[PDB]
Design a protein around this ligand. Structure first.
Ligand SMILES: [Zn+2]
Lengths: 57, 69, 47, 49, 46, 24, 304, 103, 45, 244, 172, 41, 98
């Protein structure tokens, strides 16, 4: 399940990149909350994953 | 591919509002803002699931290897 | 240059005393640094 | 802890230690044979004399 | 699952044996035989 | 140099939990 | 000091609205640890019914088998729980699915070309092109024929588009819908969003009558602050209406004359639902789980 | 019958000799029971120390610790805070039942 | 009931012994295998 | 443990084992991220499990991580807390940080557990609050005194340290003294804590407990502070915005 | 990864029960550490965050072509003004509550809508464990190979780390 | 009590104390031979 | 190549191009820095491979040949000398070091 971006350039439409979705919009909270994330590492939501977030084959 | 059943972040069922949203924009000639707000979508986590969906299954169904030509 | 020092060691008839830590790994011996720099002996009670 | 590593249960059911059975570890090493290779606090082989 | 090889020792029975970690072979009753070698040479047409 | 245009008609769409368009 | 009879005096509930799908209410004079415990149980502990095992006989469509199974499990079913009991996964599959545990749904779709003349819409052009969630048909295995005869099993949202087809293609499956909680998987969660917000408090310090009273209106939602004149100058009408935007602190005219704070005991719950249960009933079920979450520990032997 | 004998577990390595300073270990729990139970134990006027702890998030184990000033054990203080957690959920259930009748 | 499919004409097809691997309607060599009603199971997760 | 360039001997150290369920990757604390020169971006570490009691007694006593606190190059410490722990000590040990009684004992037991063996007195001891009458409150510097009162042994006296910080005395206001770190009888009386104290930095507090109390206490103090500033960040978060 | 070079590994899947929630009731999909940003300097991610949030609210899509905004016409003042029209905070911040304790957080949290990505190489086929197994017949040493239960190499540099510790039995 | 212990491998440590801080010592131009091309002389 | 712009308000297309030049010279140096000192450390670690402190505190090679007479002339470990010349810290903590 790809998505088009909300925040995008105008050349995104001229090269026809909507045919080939690269990723997915996400509600991203810039927060240090858990302690399992430093410089690289990130925290995905568990229930978002179970509902098919970033799934591929 | 097809519209996801549930929203990723809240969990509202959103899969029943894709064919509704396309007829709101085609026939009622609404903008995307009011057509999402008419469908009962009012959290921005849940807006973008219908708002920002590509629906590439229409391009995948053009390749049917069971039907001639 | 493994087979130039090997030629020099055979012409010399050189006894490897097996005390550098690269020599003991070849022969499979306890290394002579730290925990191998001494011996443990057991004081047994009876004569 | 700072002096610890987190070992997964994939590695935990493979890496084994030849613990010699004695009078003090027999209460813990009976349960390792009864758990066996399936459960984690378990064994996988016994070596005879 | 049980492949053929030599016979089982330990006065157990004559049988065929079973792999453990893909390169050592044990019998059906647990008892372990001695060290199969698995000749290999690695890579890197060419 | 031209500004980035102010998008027009942009009204309130964040209401508290259990409120709706009761603001006219 | 605290008492279980002083909590009964000060605790109040104000139900703002209620619906078949959402319920907005209040909890006055309760703790943030108690109110968070009610929030979690509604999300993670109140059980629901969802498709757990999906058995494909044929799937010649475009959507993969493991994708199309996942989309069935996310469908909210209008089963009332406690009409089912709990499954037991220590005993094998021939012993495991009795009709007291399991609801069986099936799907049988075949797409064919439609003879029609005109680009044209694909529902006037094929037959059974779009597979909706209302095509999950309830099969009353056994004694479910008489106890689920008042209330048949049907999705709460029937127009969930599950799949799309083209002629030649088919989907022939049968699902087993079982009872579970939402801390296992997010499909058994009964609620869209069960969540509270804490009551806003707007503390005026100096009077802001005059021209100050007109733009201090527009720092808040349009019903929060009230004005008449210098007489009946500036006050809060409904602090519950206020979204906490902190829009008045970005003005140096008003960054001294107001302290935005919170009432730390007044909670404002917004409970919703997927459609299986009513949101006033997933709150009674949630307040009773935490009660039974401590009866089970009081009536338990303290081992070792 | 059979009472469940793995849910609550007193850890005797942290338990006092009098009985007044103990540490319990509850399986399959998290902040839900632990933060709500700690609020109710801390309102006992005899409780000296109370806090919960989740050791690692990957297993579902809850350590709570109670220390009392004497004259009440940590098991008598745990079971008052289990009683008043039940009797607090029966006030929320009753006030919310009346207001549904009062609509 | 034996079933293949030709990749060109999508005509369903059976293939016995001592046959060419060709379609019978068209003359196409690439020819893909259909799926039948057979049980596969999935945890809906 | 190990990494692929083993350039010095602190890239191969003796970790103890904790078996964690429901996990598929090896899992490592943040105090080891500078010794292995490791960043958590898909690096693999080789794990070796020795098979007799001779080799076990050397990964416990010689190659263990507690005795690799100081490097053999120039004696600088290599082990300490990293980012969200550095930026929570500036908030916890700040002068604004006040805690009620229910908050105070939750932060002590959330980091120090007598069941796992963090205490020394078999009972968690507390301090009197620094505000008595209107509403009794503890201060955030007074939680650091409690976590050092429970992990350092009761026979020895407290730590006496006079040090500095990285944060200047003008950032806090007029006539503040929060650049001066003062420990008197094991009690933080003045100054916030930074990278300069419990980071990988010499002559701070973790480097001074290592000298007075030993390598075992200084490894427990990093573990206690790593759990203290993790549960404080979970209760009171840190965020960076567009207005920053 | 995002579209700004802020990649990173998934360190933990974290349940909604104890993940922080908002006034609106939105658990975020992705938590990113704020300690990523001071040295990487991806402030295009700080303006993608408050422009995706404005676009998901009003239903519009925004242009993010470079050199559209000036120094007189900063996008923090353009998209931020579009959050104030909705009824949100101007600065992209948002009031959050703790999912663990339940009390509200110290300040307001910078939440928005950022476009994410998923890199193709995965850790599903990377690693190996070995207790014992097949050997090489010349050397009677464990074989090389990820599939065939191969051994870990203790090479020349890893040997010298064991002489440096003085432990002659870990080298043995 | 701060003396070196007998059996300490001060030869490997001294080699690791020149090799390991030299991987840091690898940068280019900001006269005299510099860095690793100097330390390889 | 002077940038009066900042990352908060954006940088102009001329000075976006000069900043891409300085971004690449830091990456070609990493292209020529992946192993500079691999054979230097290997060749140090094998001559000095058996040099070790002896029980008479003389630094000797593996074959018995003496290299030094003490380690540094004082025989102090580097990992022990840190609070050794910190005389004020040890006086503040006299009774704890005692
Ligand atoms: Zn036998």
């Amino acid at each position: 399940t790809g998505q088009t971006p909300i925040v995008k350039a105008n050349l995104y439409d001229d090269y026809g990149m909507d045919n080939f979705p690269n990723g997915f919009n996400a509600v991203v909270a810039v927060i240090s909350y858990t302690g399992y994330d430093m410089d690289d590492a990130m925290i995905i939501n568990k229930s978002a994953d179970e509902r098919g977030f970033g799934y591929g084959t | 591919m097809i519209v996801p059943v549930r929203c990723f972040s809240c969990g509202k069922v959103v899969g029943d509002k894709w064919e509704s949203y396309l007829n709101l924009l085609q026939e009622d000639e609404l903008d995307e803002g009011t057509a999402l707000s008419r469908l009962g979508l009012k959290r921005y986590c849940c807006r973008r699931m219908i708002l920002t969906h590509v629906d590439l299954i229409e391009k995948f169904l053009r390749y049917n290897p069971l039907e001639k030509r | 240059t493994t087979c130039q020092f090997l030629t020099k060691a055979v012409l010399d008839n050189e006894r490897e005393q097996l005390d550098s830590p690269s020599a003991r790994i070849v022969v499979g011996k306890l290394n002579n640094v730290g925990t191998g720099s001494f011996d443990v002996l057991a004081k047994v009670p009876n004569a | 802890e700072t002096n610890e590593i987190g070992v997964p249960p994939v590695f935990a059911v493979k890496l084994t230690y030849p613990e010699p059975v004695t009078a003090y570890n027999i209460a813990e090493l009976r349960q390792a044979v009864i758990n066996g290779p399936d459960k984690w606090p378990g064994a996988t082989q016994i070596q005879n004399e | 699952t049980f492949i053929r090889g030599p016979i089982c020792g330990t006065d157990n029975c004559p049988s065929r044996l079973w792999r453990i970690i893909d390169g050592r072979r044990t019998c059906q009753y647990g008892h372990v035989m001695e060290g199969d070698v698995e000749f290999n040479d690695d890579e890197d047409l060419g | 140099r031209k500004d980035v245009p102010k998008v027009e008609g942009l009204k309130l769409e964040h209401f508290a939990t259990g409120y709706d368009a009761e603001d006219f | 000091e605290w008492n279980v009879e002083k909590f009964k005096k000060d605790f109040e509930v104000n139900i703002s609205s209620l619906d078949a799908r959402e319920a907005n209410f209040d909890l006055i004079n309760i703790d943030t640890s108690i109110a968070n415990a009610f929030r979690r149980i509604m999300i993670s502990e109140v059980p629901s019914v969802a498709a757990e095992y999906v058995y494909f006989f044929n799937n010649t469509s475009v959507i993969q088998d493991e994708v199309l199974a996942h989309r069935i499990g996310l469908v909210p079913l209008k089963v009332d729980p406690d009409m089912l009991t709990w499954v037991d996964s220590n005993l094998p599959d021939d012993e495991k699915f009795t009709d007291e545990n399991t609801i069986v749904l099936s799907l049988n779709v075949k797409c064919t070309r439609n003879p029609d003349a005109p680009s044209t819409d694909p529902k006037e052009l094929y037959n059974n092109a779009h597979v909706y969630a209302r095509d999950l048909k309830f099969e009353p295995q056994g004694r479910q024929s008489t106890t689920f005869a008042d209330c048949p099993v049907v999705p709460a949202d029937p127009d969930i588009l599950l799949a799309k087809l083209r002629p030649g293609q088919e989907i022939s499956l049968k699902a087993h819908c079982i009872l579970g909680i939402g801390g296992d998987h997010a499909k058994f969660s009964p609620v869209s969003t069960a969540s509270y917000r804490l009551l806003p408090q707007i503390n005026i310090l100096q009077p802001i009558k005059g021209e100050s009273a007109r733009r201090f209106q527009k720092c808040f939602p349009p019903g929060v602050i009230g004005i008449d004149e210098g007489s009946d100058e500036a006050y809060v009408k409904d602090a519950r209406k206020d979204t906490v935007s902190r829009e008045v602190l970005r003005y140096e005219e008003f960054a001294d004359k107001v302290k935005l704070g919170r009432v730390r005991n007044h909670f404002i719950f917004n409970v919703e639902s997927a459609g299986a249960m009513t949101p006033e009933e997933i709150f009674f079920k949630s307040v009773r789980i935490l009660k039974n979450k401590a009866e089970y520990l009081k009536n338990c032997p303290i081992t070792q | 019958e059979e009472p469940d004998r793995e849910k609550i577990k007193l850890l005797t390595q942290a338990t006092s000799e009098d009985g007044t300073s103990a540490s319990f270990q509850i399986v399959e729990e998290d902040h839900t029971l632990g933060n709500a139970l700690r609020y109710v134990i801390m309102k006992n006027p005899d409780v000296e120390f109370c806090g919960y702890s989740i050791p690692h998030p990957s297993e579902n184990l809850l350590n709570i610790r109670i220390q009392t000033y004497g004259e009440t054990t940590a098991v008598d203080a745990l079971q008052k805070g289990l009683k008043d957690l039940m009797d607090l959920c029966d006030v929320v259930e009753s006030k919310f039942t009346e207001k549904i009748k009062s609509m | 009931t034996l079933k293949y499919i030709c990749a060109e004409c999508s005509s369903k097809l059976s293939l016995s012994r001592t046959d060419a691997v060709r379609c019978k309607d068209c003359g196409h060599r690439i020819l893909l295998k259909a799926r039948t009603k057979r049980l596969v199971q999935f945890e809906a997760r | 443990m190990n990494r692929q360039p083993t350039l010095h001997k602190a890239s191969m150290m003796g970790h103890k084992v904790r078996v964690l369920p429901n996990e598929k990757t090896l899992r490592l604390h943040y105090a080891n991220t500078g010794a292995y020169n490791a960043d958590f971006d898909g690096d693999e570490m080789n794990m070796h499990f020795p098979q007799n009691e001779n080799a076990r007694a050397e990964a416990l006593n010689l190659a263990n991580t507690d005795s690799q606190y100081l490097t053999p190059t120039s004696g600088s410490p290599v082990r300490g807390l990293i980012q969200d722990h550095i930026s929570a000590g500036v908030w916890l040990t700040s002068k604004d940080s006040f805690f009620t009684r229910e908050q105070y004992q939750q932060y002590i037991y959330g980091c120090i557990r007598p069941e796992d063996g963090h205490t020394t007195r078999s009972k968690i001891v507390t301090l009197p609050p620094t505000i008595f009458k209107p509403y009794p409150l503890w201060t955030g510097k007074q939680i650091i005194t409690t976590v050092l009162l429970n992990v350092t042994p009761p026979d020895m006296p407290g730590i006496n340290l006079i040090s500095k910080n990285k944060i200047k005395n003008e950032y806090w206001g007029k006539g503040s003294l929060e650049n001066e770190v003062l420990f008197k009888d094991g009690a933080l009386l003045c100054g916030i804590l930074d990278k300069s104290q419990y980071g990988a930095s010499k002559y701070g507090i973790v480097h001074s407990l290592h000298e007075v109390y030993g390598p075992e206490v200084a490894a427990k103090v990093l573990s206690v502070l790593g759990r203290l500033f993790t549960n404080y960040i979970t209760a009171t978060a840190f965020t960076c915005g567009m207005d920053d | 990864s995002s579209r700004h070079g802020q990649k990173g590994v998934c360190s933990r899947k974290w349940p909604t029960i104890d993940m922080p929630f908002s006034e609106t009731g939105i658990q975020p999909d992705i938590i990113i550490n704020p300690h990523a940003f001071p040295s990487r300097m991806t402030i295009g991610m700080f303006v993608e965050s408050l422009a995706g949030k404005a676009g998901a609210l009003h239903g519009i899509a925004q242009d993010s072509t470079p050199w559209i905004f000036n120094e007189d016409d900063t996008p923090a003042d353009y998209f931020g003004e579009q959050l104030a029209k909705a009824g949100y905070n101007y600065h992209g911040n948002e009031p959050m509550y703790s999912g663990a304790t339940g009390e509200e957080l110290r300040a307001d949290i910078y939440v928005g809508v950022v476009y994410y990505q998923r890199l193709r190489h995965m850790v599903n086929d990377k690693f190996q464990v070995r207790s014992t197994g097949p050997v090489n017949s010349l050397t009677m040493q464990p074989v090389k190979g990820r599939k065939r239960h191969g051994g870990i190499r203790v090479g020349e540099m890893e040997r010298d780390a064991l002489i440096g510790h003085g432990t002659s039995f870990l080298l043995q | 009590r701060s003396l070196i212990n007998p059996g300490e491998a001060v030869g490997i440590i001294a080699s690791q104390s020149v090799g390991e801080p030299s991987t840091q010592m690898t940068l280019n131009t900001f006269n005299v031979t510099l860095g690793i091309p100097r330390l390889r002389e | 190549g002077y940038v009066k712009g900042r990352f908060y308000s954006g940088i102009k297309p001329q000075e976006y191009y000069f900043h891409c030049m300085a971004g690449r010279e830091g990456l070609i140096d990493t292209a020529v820095k992946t192993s500079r000192s691999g054979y230097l450390q290997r060749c140090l670690t094998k001559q000095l491979e058996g040099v070790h402190v002896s029980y008479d505190n003389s630094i000797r090679d593996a074959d018995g040949t003496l290299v030094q007479f003490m380690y540094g002339g004082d025989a102090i470990d580097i990992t022990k000398e840190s609070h050794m010349t910190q005389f004020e810290f040890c006086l503040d903590n006299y009774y704890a070091l005692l």
